[PDB]
C-alpha cells in the first residue's frame, strides 16, 4: 500500500495538516470566498515549490503532479485527481485483447465498471468484488480510465468492461492496468449520531450503552485475568454501542445479474450476502452521509441472497433519495423499528433540484480549491443544522422540514462541488449562542461513529469520557439529557474504578516473579540493550514481536513479555501474583449501585 | 528466532550453564569409574545452586539441562532415555490420528534407525520422495506413551502411513495422536575430506592436494560479485578456507530394507544407491561415515549400482558399512571418488575392531546420563587428539603407529560414543604421550574441528591470527614431506593476507555515506531503531532487525553498512562504478597467482 499516482511516477507534496484547516474557516457559499481560498492556495504551492506545476491536482493537504516522470493522462487535468491519490493495495494486468467492451452508459449500473471471472490477485473470492482504478495503457500513455467497482463470478467466462463509463478518448491502449484501492470486506454497521439526529426512533438515546473494545493484544490479557492495572487508562477501551448491529456490504446494481447469468429482482427489493433475514422480511436501507431530512434511511424488502459476497444489491430507483451510487458506496441494512431498529424509514417527499448553473473547473488546482472550500461549508451546514435541532428540541419545538430540505440541498451541492463549479443555493445560517448537546457529542463521539479510531493519546481519552459528567451544562432535548444519566453513571463508575490503578507496579512485579530469560541470540541481547539505553524500548519491542521472539527469552522485559506469552503462561503468572481479573472488577463497576 | 527445542514446546524448562564450568569441570577426567563419579558429583552440586532441588526427570548434554516440572509432557518411558527426544530443534511439526497408522512389526524392520515409511507429507518433507530426521510421539494429554527417534522416508508409492512399531520406546499402549517433529529437514550435506580423515586414511602425500579458496556468505557474496573494493572484505581471513582437489556427495543414510515397501527390488551386496548421476552403475566409490576412526576403517569401497528412490540420500547395507559404525538414525553417508579417480581417502581392507559384551549397566537417573555424556565427551577428545599427535612423533622419524595401537584407540573412541547412552566399562588403554609442538597441534589452530569448512563466526581479531599460523610451520614436528610440501600453500595464504592487511573498510563506508542520495522518508519506528543503535553503539543489532523486517534500500542510505545489505545487484554495481573501486576479486586473484 503506497499510492497509485506514485507508481505512475507522480510527485506528491504533503502540506502541513494544520495549514489548510486554518485557511478553510474563512469560507462562505460565495463566488468570492471561493476565489479567496483559490488565491490563498495558489500562493501556498508557490511558497513551497516556486511555481504552478503543470497539471496539478489536490485533495486536502495532499497535492500531486506529474513532472515528466509522470505517466500522461489523455483526459482533462481536473478529472485526473480521481485516479492518482488512492492507495494501490493490489495490482493486476489484462491485455486489451481479452476484454469484451460491453457498450452503454451505466450498463452494469452507475458505478460498476467491470464484470469479470475469478481474479484472485485482486479479489479474494470467486464470489467477490474490489473497488478499483483501471487504465488502458501504452508505455507512458493512458488513453481511457475507469473508476468504480468490479465484481467476479464463476459463471462469468470472459472479462467484460463498461467501455462508455470510461474517461479518456476513443482510442484504447494495448494493456488494461487495474489497481484495487479497496479489498473485499464487510463493513461495521452501527448507528451514527447524525443518523440518530436525523431519523432516530423516539427516545433513541434511551437505547445507547457502554461497551469495551480491546485490540487482540489487550484482549489476550483480559481473557487471562490480567489485573485492571494493566488496562490503564480504561477509557482507551471504551465505546458506545447500539441495542443491535446492522449488515454492511458494497453496493451493487441488479443490472449486473443478467451478466452473472441470473434472473433479476423485484421493485422495492434488496439482496445481501447474509442469512440474517428471511426472504420477505422488511429492513432499513441506509447510505451515508445521513442527510438532515432523514431521507438516507428507506424501508425495502429483503428478497434473498446476493450472488456476490460482502454486498447489497438494490435498484437505483429505490435508493435514489439516499444519494447512493455503485462506485464504492457502502450499503447498510438495519432492522426496522418494529424489530428493534433505531433508524426510522423516510416517508417524506424528497427529490431535490434538477440543475443549477454549472461550469467545470478551469484547472485541477481550481478543483482542489473548490474541494477544500466546499469541505468546510459541508461541515458548517452539518453542525449548524444539528445544533438547531438542539435549540429547537430544548424549546419544546422542532426544526421545520423546509429548513432540513434547504440544509440537505447545501450538503449535496457541497459534495458535488468536489467535482465541478456549481452555484450554491441560498441558505441562511442561524447561529446558536449556547453550548448544545451537539457540542457534547462532538467531544464524546468525535465524527459520530460509535467506533472510535484510537489514534488519540492516553492523556486525552480520559478527558473525552469525563465529558459525560457535564450533560446538565448543555442545551437540548429535556428527555435526551435526563434519559442519558444512567449511562453517564455507568461511564463514571468504570472510569473511577480504574483511576488510580496504574500499571507500573504490576510491570515491576512481573519482572521479579517471572524466571530469568532462557538463552537468546546476541542480536537480541543487543537490541534490548539498545532500546533501554536510549528510550526506544517500544520500537525494539515492536521489532522483537515482529521478528517472532519467544516468550521464554523476554521475561526481563515484562511489557514485551506480555505481548509474546500464551494464554496459559499469562494465566499462570497472574495466579502467582493473585491479581483479580480485570473483567470481574469491570462488570461489578458496570452493574453497581 | 522461531525454531525452539521440542522440550520447550512440550512444557519443559531449561538452563544453560556457562561454557566455563563445563570445559573446566570435565578437563580433569580419566577412563576410570571414579573420574565419572566426580564429574557426576560436581554437576549434581552445580544444579544444586542456580536451582532449588535436582528436579525429577532432568536430562542433559554438555552445558545444557532440561526438566519437566509443572507442565512438560510426562513420558511413559525410562527418564534417562527421554534425553534423546526433548533436546533437539523442532523445525517443523505435523500430526496424524492413531487410526491412520499401519503398524509393521519386528525390530530394525525398515533398517536400524528408520522409523516410518510414509506417503508424501508436505508439512515435514519438501520432496514427495523425501526424508526427515524426526522425533515422533504417541500422545494423550500430557501423556507421551511411546516415542520414536530416527528417519522417516516418503514415497508416492507408499499408500498407508507405515510405521516401525517395535523400534519405539515406552509401553505398548498408544495415545490418539502421532505428533511428529522434524529436527533436520531434507538436505544434501557438504562433502569434504576432514583432517582426521586424511590422518587416518589419506592417500600417500595427501596434504599436497589442499589449496586456498574463498567462502563468502550471501551478503558479502552479493558485494564481491558487484565488484565491491577489497576494503569491504576486511579482514579477508574470515572468508578464507582450505579446499580438497575435489568434493564428495553427502546424503542421509538409508537401508535397502525400505525398498520392498516402496514396491522396489532390493540391492546386491557390496552396492550403494545414491541420489546422484555423478557415478555410472558399475563404478566404485569410497563410502565414508564419520567420525573417521584411527584404524582407517571409516572409508570402505563399494559399487554404485544406481539412483536412490529417495532424494538427498544414500542406500547401503548395515552389513557393508558396519566397520564405519553407521546406522540410520540420522547418520550421514559420504561418497568420494576412489584414489584411482582423484579421491584422497583410501578404502579399508582389514578386520574391524567392534568388541561386544563387556560389562554394561545403565545410568540410573538421566543426570547420570548427562554426567556420563560430559565425562565421555572429554575422554573421547583426548584419545582422538592423543592418537593423531603420536602419528606426528612417528612419521617424524620415519615410522608408523603400530596398527595394534590404532585399533585400541578406535575401540576406546567407540566406547566413549557408546557411553553416551549406557554406563559401559572402559577398556584398558595406554596413553603413550609426547610433549612437543606436533603438526596435529598446528592443524587444531589452522583448522579447528578438522572440517575444511570453518565454523561460522569467530571474532574478527582472532581469525586473522589463525591464518597467520601458516607462518610458523617449522616450529612443528611431524612428517618431513608434509611440512615441506605445504610451503606453497602457506605462501599463498600469506600473499592473500598481506594483500588486504591495511585495506580497512572505514574510508569506503564514509565515502558511500556521501555518494548516496539522502534517504527517502521512513516510518518513525525505523527512525527510532536507528537512533537507538546510534546512541548505544549497537547499530549492527539494529541493522539485523531492519534487514529481517525488510527495510528498502532507498531508506537506509545514511547507514552504509545497512545500505550494503538491502541494495540490489544493480544499485551496488552503480555506486562502485561511481567511486571507481577496483573489484576485490581482481586483487584477490592477483594475490593467488603471484610468484
Ligand atoms: Mg459515490
Ligand atoms: Mg547412529
Automatic annotation (TrEMBL), chain A:
<feature type="binding site">
    <location>
        <position position="329"/>
    </location>
    <ligand>
        <name>Mg(2+)</name>
    </ligand>
</feature>
<feature type="binding site">
    <location>
        <position position="325"/>
    </location>
    <ligand>
        <name>Mg(2+)</name>
    </ligand>
</feature>
<keyword id="KW-0479">Metal-binding</keyword>
<protein>
    <submittedName>
        <fullName>Uncharacterized protein</fullName>
    </submittedName>
</protein>
<dbReference type="GO" id="GO:0046872">
    <property type="term" value="F:metal ion binding"/>
</dbReference>
<feature type="binding site">
    <location>
        <position position="327"/>
    </location>
    <ligand>
        <name>Mg(2+)</name>
    </ligand>
</feature>
From TrEMBL, chain B:
<protein>
    <submittedName>
        <fullName>Uncharacterized protein</fullName>
    </submittedName>
</protein>
<feature type="binding site">
    <location>
        <position position="327"/>
    </location>
    <ligand>
        <name>Mg(2+)</name>
    </ligand>
</feature>
<dbReference type="GO" id="GO:0046872">
    <property type="term" value="F:metal ion binding"/>
</dbReference>
<feature type="binding site">
    <location>
        <position position="329"/>
    </location>
    <ligand>
        <name>Mg(2+)</name>
    </ligand>
</feature>
<keyword id="KW-0479">Metal-binding</keyword>
<feature type="binding site">
    <location>
        <position position="331"/>
    </location>
    <ligand>
        <name>Mg(2+)</name>
    </ligand>
</feature>
